[PDB]
Design a protein around this ligand. Structure first.
Ligand SMILES: C[C@@H]1CN(CC(=O)N2CCCC2)CC[NH2+]1
Ligand SMILES: [Zn+2]
Length: 106
């Protein structure tokens, strides 16, 4: 499934922060659930699989050093939720950061 880059959320049932939060339940994983919800993510109930309510972009295997908004920008750069909450300056920063990384680690 392709990522939603329209201004309309793919899962409007999950558009409220309240809604997203309930999906987690007791959360054992290394990334903060409220942080994840704030970044538009709700839990799938399979390991630490989250999905963004707006773009539908899915992310998994959360390391403690990984930020929700950073990972959102990384994999779902076309998400209009992301664009709106963070701004384009932030998204460019994130991209330049990750690309410069993949060329210093590399
Ligand atoms: C949270 C972070 C996400 N990474 C990539 C991922 O989960 N993807 C699934 C769809 C394509 C990118 C793995 C490491 N942990
Ligand atoms: Zn998104």
């Amino acid at each position: 499934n392709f990522p939603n880059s329209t201004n309309l959320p793919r899962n409007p049932s999950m558009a409220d922060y309240e809604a997203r939060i309930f999906t987690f339940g007791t959360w054992i994983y290394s990334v903060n659930k409220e942080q994840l919800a704030r970044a538009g993510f709700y839990a799938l109930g399979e390991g630490d699989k989250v999905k963004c309510f707006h773009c539908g972009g899915g992310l998994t295997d959360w390391k403690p050093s990984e930020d929700p908004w950073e990972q959102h920008a990384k994999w779902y750069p076309g998400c209009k939720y992301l664009l709106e909450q963070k701004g384009q300056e932030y998204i460019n920063n994130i991209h330049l950061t990750h690309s410069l990384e993949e060329c210093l680690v590399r």
